[PDB]
From a paper:
The iron-dependent regulator [name] is the main transcriptional regulator controlling iron homeostasis genes in Actinobacteria, including species from the Corynebacterium, Mycobacterium and Streptomyces genera, as well as the erythromycin-producing bacterium [name]. [name] is an OCS from the [name] (Diphtheria toxin repressor) family of transcriptional regulators which typically consist of three domains: an N-terminal DNA-binding winged helix-turn-helix (wHTH) motif, followed by a dimerization interface that contains most of the metal-binding residues, and a C-terminal SH3-like domain (21–23). The main function of [name] is to repress the expression of iron uptake genes when the intracellular iron levels are sufficient. When iron levels are sufficient for iron ions to occupy the [name] metal-binding sites, the regulator is activated and recognizes a highly conserved 19-bp sequence located in the promoter region of its target genes.
Due to the similarities between both metals, and the constraints of working with Fe2+, we used Co2+ to activate [name] in all of the subsequent DNA-binding experiments. We then co-crystallized [name] with a 30-bp double-stranded DNA oligomer containing the consensus sequence TTAGGTTAGSCTAACCTAA (S = G or C, i.e. G in the forward strand and C in the reverse strand). Crystal structures were obtained for the complexes with the physiological activator Fe2+ as well as the mimic Co2+. Both crystallized in space group C2, containing four polypeptide chains forming two dimers and two DNA strands forming a distorted B-type double helix in the asymmetric unit. Each [name] subunit binds to one of the four CCTAA repeats of the recognition sequence, one dimer interacting with repeats 1 and 3 and the other with repeats 2 and 4. Both metal-binding sites of each [name] subunit are occupied in both the Fe2+ and Co2+ complexes. No significant differences between the Fe2+-activated and Co2+-activated [name]-DNA complexes can be discerned, neither globally, nor at the metal-binding sites. The structures of these [name] dimers are very similar to the DNA-free dimer structure. Notably, only one direct hydrogen bond is formed between the protein and a DNA base, between Gln43 and the first cytosine of each CCTAA repeat, or guanine at the central G-C basepair of the palindrome. Interestingly, in the DNA complex structures we observe a swap of the SH3-like domains of one subunit of each [name] dimer with a symmetry-related chain.
Residue numbers in the entry:
A (entry chain C), B (entry chain B): 2 to 140, 146 to 231
C (entry chain aa): 141 to 230
D (entry chain dd): 141 to 231
E (entry chain D), F (entry chain A): 3 to 140
The structure:
Amino acid sequence: NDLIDTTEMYLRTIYDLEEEGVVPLRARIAERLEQSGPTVSQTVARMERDGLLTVAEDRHLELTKAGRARAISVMRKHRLAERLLVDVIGLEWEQVHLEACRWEHVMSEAVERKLVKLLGNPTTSPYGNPIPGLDELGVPVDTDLRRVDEVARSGGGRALVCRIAEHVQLDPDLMSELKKVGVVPGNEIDIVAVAGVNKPIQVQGSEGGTQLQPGIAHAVMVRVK
Amino acid sequence: NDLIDTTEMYLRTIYDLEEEGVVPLRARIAERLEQSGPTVSQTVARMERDGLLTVAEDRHLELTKAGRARAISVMRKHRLAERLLVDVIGLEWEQVHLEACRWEHVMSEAVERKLVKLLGNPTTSPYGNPIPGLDELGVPVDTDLRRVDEVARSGGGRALVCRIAEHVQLDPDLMSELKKVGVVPGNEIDIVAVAGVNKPIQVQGSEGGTQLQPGIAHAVMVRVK
Amino acid sequence: GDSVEPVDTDLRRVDEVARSGGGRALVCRIAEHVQLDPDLMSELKKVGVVPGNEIDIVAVAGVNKPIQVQGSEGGTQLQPGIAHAVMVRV
Amino acid sequence: GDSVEPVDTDLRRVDEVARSGGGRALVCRIAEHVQLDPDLMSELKKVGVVPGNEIDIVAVAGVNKPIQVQGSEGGTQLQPGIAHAVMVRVK
Amino acid sequence: DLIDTTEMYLRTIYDLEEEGVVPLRARIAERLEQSGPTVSQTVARMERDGLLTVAEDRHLELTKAGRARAISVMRKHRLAERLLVDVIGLEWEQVHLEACRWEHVMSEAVERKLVKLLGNPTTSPYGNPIPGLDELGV
Amino acid sequence: DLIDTTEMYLRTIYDLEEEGVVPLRARIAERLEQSGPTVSQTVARMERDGLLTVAEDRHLELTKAGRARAISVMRKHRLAERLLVDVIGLEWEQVHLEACRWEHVMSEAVERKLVKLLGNPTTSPYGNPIPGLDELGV
DNA sequence: GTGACTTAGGTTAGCCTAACCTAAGTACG
DNA sequence: CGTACTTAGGTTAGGCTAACCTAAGTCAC
Ligand SMILES: [Co+2]
Ligand SMILES: [Co+2]
Ligand SMILES: [Co+2]
Ligand SMILES: [Co+2]
Ligand SMILES: [Co+2]
Ligand SMILES: [Co+2]
Ligand SMILES: [Co+2]
Ligand SMILES: [Co+2]
C-alpha cells in the first residue's frame, strides 16, 4: 500500500503509539506500515539525520521539537479531513479513515483554517480522538478514560464508548461490525470480564455483541458508569 | 548472477579496466557486472569506507595500497586457476575463464604456492595475460604490443596474437569462434584496414576469418610483423 | 470530449479573436496553465476576466504581441500563451 | 548410500569396538567432523590412524570416556565424538 | 512536489490537448520545470508501461489506458476545485494549487459523494468541462 | 566464511547422517558456530524453499531436492580433496579446509574432468565414499 | 535442571526501481 | 542557429531478502 509521504507516516505512527500508551519501537512501525526491519531502520536514520527524532539507549523513538510539531500538523489535517468527510461530504463511516490517511499529506494550512470555520471549530474526530495543534491554526481532562481490556481484566461492567484509536480504523470490515452492533462513540456497552493478558474481550452493544482482540480492546477508550 | 565475493570482483573489474587502458568509472562496473547505478555507488562507498579505493574529482576509481595488493591477489589466483584447469584438469579452452572467475574467491595462498611448483613457475595465463604478485608467493617490456583496433585504423597488416583480455573471455560462444578460425595466442592474423572509430574490425586467421566489435578488438593485443 | 473538442463550435481563443479584429465576447473557460499563476488569476478577477462576464478584446496584429482586454472593472494585457489559454463566445 | 548405510556391514565405529572389549582393526573412514581440527589430523597422521593402517583399540567402560588407540608409530587418546566418527573393520 | 509523477505527466499532456498545443517532451519540461533528460526518461518509462506512444513527429499520443487515467485525474481535479470554491470557500486564486495536490489522493467513492453535494456540476469554477462523469456512473 | 549458507547446512545434515547422529538444529549451531535463532531461521528458509522438513520429533529430514543438492556438494568436496592430495600435493591436514570452500564453486564439467584425471576414484583420501557419481554419468 | 528451541528486536551486506540532476554532445529545418 | 532531444554518468529516497547477532523468555523429560 502507498504511504504517499514516508516521513509524515513514520511521525504519525510514533504519535499513534504514544496515544495508545505503547512504547514507540521500530518493530512497531515495521508491523503497522508493513515494511521490513532493514527498511524501517534506514528510514529512521534519514529522519534522525534531518533532526525529526532520536533513538534512545533502550531503542525507543523520541520526537524532536520539529518532529512533534510536524506529527501534530499531519494528525490535525487527518482529523479535520475525517470531520469534512463525515459532516459535509457524507462518506460512509468505515471508509473515512482510509481517505483521510491520504488527504493528511496534501492539505495546506490555508484549507485547514477554512475547514475550522466551516465545521464550527471541531475539537474531536468522528472517532472521538482530540484534534491537536489548533493553537498554530488560530483558535477535557481525559484522566477518567480507561482501556476496554484493562476494565475487563479489573472486573468489567457498563461503560460509555469515547475513543477508537487510528490503529482500529484501518480495518473497514471491523468498523462496519462496530457500527452494526453499536460500539461507536456516545453509545453504552457491557464489557464481559476476562482473566490475564492476550484474551479476546467480549462486548454487548445496543444492537447485539461481538469479540475484540487484545490489541483492538487496548485501542478503544471508555468511561465506566 | 552470483559474484561469490562482491568486494573482490569490484577490485578485479578496476584492475581489468586499467589493463585494457580504459578509465575505471562506476559506469564501467555497472555495465560489466550488470548491476544498477545506485547499487555500484553504494558498494564503492563501503570499499572507500574500508580504504580499498578512493573516488577522484573526475570520478575515476583509484585503488589504495591495500586495494591494489588485494586486486593483484585475486588476479594471481584467477590466472593460476586457469593454468591448472587447462594444463592439468584439461577443461575446454572457452569454459576455463568462467570456472576461474569463481575459484579466484576460494583459493588459499598455501594452494597458490603448491600450484606454482606443479605448473613450473607460470608467468602468463592460457590467454597470454601476465600473472602478477608472484613476489608475495616466493618466486618482458611488452611496450611493442598494440591493440587490434589501433592497428586496423593505422593501416592494418599481419601481427602475432599475444593477449586476450578478461572482458573477452566472459563470452564462451565468441571464445569458441576465436579458437576455430585461430585468433588464439601464438597464431598469426591479418587485421583488415578500417577508417575512424567504433567500426567492426575484420581479421583472417589460420583456419578462416571473423568480425571483432570495437570493444573486443580494443581488448585483443598483438605484435605486428 | 467537450474538454478537447467543444460541443459549442462557436467557442474561440482570445488571441485568435484579437488577430481577426477584436470583438465583445463572453468569457467561458480559463485553462489549467493560466490557473498556475496566482498573481495573474487575482488580476483577472480584479478587472473581471472570469467565466460568465462579457469582455472587450482589442484588435491585434502579428504573433508574440500582448493582447489588450477590457473588463467591467478596467483592462489588462494578456501574454500570447495566456490569451491562447482563455476561450470565449463572440 | 554407501556413505550413510555401508555395503560392507562389518564396518564398525571405534567407540563401539572399545565398549565391546577392544580389538585390532583396519582404519577405513575418518568423517568430515574429525577433519575440521587440523592439529588433531596431524596427530592421527603421526601415530598412524590413517585409512589402510591396522590400529589397536583399547577396551573402555562407560560413556563420555576417552578411547585409547595404538598405531604403528605410537598411541593417542580420541574424544568420544571423534572416536564415534572413525569407522574400522575388525582384524 | 508533484505528489505523483505519472499522473502529472498524463494531466500535463491533457492540458496541452485542451489548449490546442502539440504535446512535446519540451512542453512538459517547461511546465513541470524538469530537465529535458528527466522528461525523456519518465516518458520512456510511461511508454514502457503502455500509458503513451511517441509518434513519428515526436508528439506524445496517450493510449486507451493513458487517457482513462488522464480523465480520472482531471475529473478529480475539477470536482476538488468546485468543493474548494462552493463549500470550503478557499480564495479563487489559491484553489487550483490545492486541487493540483488533491487530484492524486481522491477516491471515486468521494467523487460520487461530491457529485451529489455539488448538484451534478458539468464545469469547474474556471468554466472547464468535467470529463469522465460517465465512468463514475452519474 | 561459509561461502554458501544453504549448501553448508545441507552438507552438515549429511555429515550427521554419515556419523549416525540425530540431525537437530542444536547440532548445526555447534558445528557451524552459529546462534540457535540463526539456525532456526535459516532452517525455516530451507523448509520454505522445500530443501528439508522438521519432523514431529524436531529432527531435520532432507527432501528429494535437498538430498540431491547435499550429494552434489559432498561429491564436489571429496573430488576436490583427491585433486588437492594426489595431484596438487597440499598437506594432508589442510586439505579438507580448502575443499570446504572449493565444494561451492566447482562445476559438474570440472567434476567429470577430475574423475578421468584421478582414475575413477570411489573414496576421498580419508576413506569416505564419493556419492552421486551416477548423477555425473560416470 | 540442563538441553532444545522460540520470542523479540536488532544488525550489515548487497541488491532493486523511480525520479530527479548537469555537462556536452547530435539532428534538424 | 536556435529548438528538440540524446548520450553519458551521476544523485537521493525508499524499498527488498539473506544471513548474522544478543537477551530473555517457554517447554519437556
Ligand atoms: Co483516522
Ligand atoms: Co497517511
Ligand atoms: Co580469465
Ligand atoms: Co570472480
Ligand atoms: Co485547475
Ligand atoms: Co497534481
Ligand atoms: Co573433507
Ligand atoms: Co563448505
